[PDB]
Amino acid sequence: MDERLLQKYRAQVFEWGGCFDKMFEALKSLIYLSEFENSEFDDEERHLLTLCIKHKISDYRTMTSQVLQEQTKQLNNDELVKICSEYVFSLRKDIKAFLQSFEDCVDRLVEKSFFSKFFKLKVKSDISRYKLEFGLCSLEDSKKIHQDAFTLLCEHPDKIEQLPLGFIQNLAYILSEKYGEKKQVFNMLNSLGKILELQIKEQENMDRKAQITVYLQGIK
Amino acid sequence: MDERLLQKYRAQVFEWGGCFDKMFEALKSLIYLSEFENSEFDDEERHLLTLCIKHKISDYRTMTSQVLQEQTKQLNNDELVKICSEYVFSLRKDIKAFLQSFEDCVDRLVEKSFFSKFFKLKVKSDISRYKLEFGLCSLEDSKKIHQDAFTLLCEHPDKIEQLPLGFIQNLAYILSEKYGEKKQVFNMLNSLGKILELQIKEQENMDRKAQITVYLQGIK
């Protein structure tokens, strides 16, 4: 066990203990080590990275809502209300800081495999949606990152099976329903569908035909 | 609003946000301020103090049990198990440190009212039970603190109504069921009962008679 494996273990154990700030410190070390050695993350490392932001955001939401709920039930205590507001503001400043640091890390992810390139853009897209909500980026800049991930997917139909189908569906869903690209997405996926139909036709192996069909169906 | 009131507010707000370590820092400041001014805690300050230890202990228990549960479900990963054990040990060391610091604070509580004297001993008793479990005190030393609180209660039957009835019942319950003083406790409470019967007999006011009866019944 070297430092990189230790940090995977520490990140998991901190996640189990609900210590998301210590988990993030271990992940920062993973990012640095992988970058230093120019060695792509494995899937367990990627999963811990996305769990970290999920948890930090969820905590922020819970803590904020708990304080605001209690604030409103205090009758006529202007001073206590001000303390609640100050605390709520600090929590928001801290989550914004977290998003900035986490995004620094994600930008430094090593890319080699097709999935690693798509993964970086997917996670950057996810970050941009939080940054949109929290006053850290424009709608234009957020949309652009989602478009970049969708473009990469569509430029390499031969490698579609290297990507999780749910990532594909969520990106399609977000771009069409939230960014007003329903027409672009339907058109691009129509084309991707045809390319997969051909892949299926040309694939001799019956089990492989069925595997590609999962994506073809998933895309419709 | 002065610093002492601010810290009451900060302690409450940190409790609402589930930030028990920040809550404890605010309480440490309350303790120092009250000690400095020789000015007894009010009941809201006392309640925040006992909430703090309740929460810290509950968190420790949850975090420990979560990590141990996951540890056992990993098949053959000796290195990850060792990391889990190291983390579990650190959490225990930290809760022990917390108990030491919290006990320092409680020892520095200002005493003036009868209830403030009983409260200090009651909280010290509660701390001693955790310290017993965590290897920080002997059974003898824990028992002694519980006896000191029970003695104070019994030496001042005229002031019984200044104490919460549940505190009295819990102390009686603990001393008789956990410290093998069933005989002492039954005897002392028999005597306290008789003193309250007399107080009731001698109290002209009917509403006051009923108020004392609540304690007389509670004690049986």
Numbering used by the authors:
A (entry chain A), B (entry chain A): 8 to 227
Sentences from the study reporting this entry:
One protein family common to humans, C. parvum and in fact all eukaryotes is the group of tyrosine 3-monooxygenase/tryptophan 5-monooxygenase activation proteins (YWHA), also known as 14-3-3 proteins. All 14-3-3 proteins are dimers, with each subunit comprised of nine α-helices framing a peptide-binding cleft. The dimer is shaped like the letter “W” from one angle, with an un-partitioned bicameral pocket where a substrate protein is held at two typically phosphorylated sites in the two component clefts. The parasite Cryptosporidium parvum has three 14-3-3 proteins: Cp14ε, Cp14a and Cp14b, with only Cp14ε similar to human 14-3-3 proteins in sequence, peptide-binding properties and structure.
Structurally, Cp14a features the classical 14-3-3 dimer but with a uniquely wide pocket and a disoriented RRY triad potentially incapable of binding phosphopeptides. Cp14a shares limited sequence identity with Cp14ε and all other known proteins. First, while the Cp14a structure also adopts the classic dimeric α-helical structure, it stands out by virtue of its unusual width. More strikingly, Cp14a is further distinguished by the natural absence of a C-terminal tail ensuing the last helix. Even the second arginine and the ensuing tyrosine are skewed in their orientations with respect to what is typical in other 14-3-3 proteins, with or without ligands bound. This is the first known instance of a disoriented 14-3-3 triad (superposed on Cp14ε for comparison in Fig. 4D). The mode of dimerization of Cp14a deviates from that of other 14-3-3 proteins. While the two subunits form an aperture similar to that in the human 14-3-3 proteins and Cp14ε, the side chain interactions around the aperture are primarily hydrophobic, with Cys26 and Met70 of opposite chains occupying the position of the Arg-Glu salt bridge conserved in most other homologs. One intuitive conclusion is that this protein supports a large substrate; however, its disoriented Arg-Arg-Tyr triad, the lack of a C-terminal tail and our negative screening results make this C. parvum chaperone even more divergent from others and introduces the possibility that this is a degenerate 14-3-3 protein, or at least one that is functionally unique.
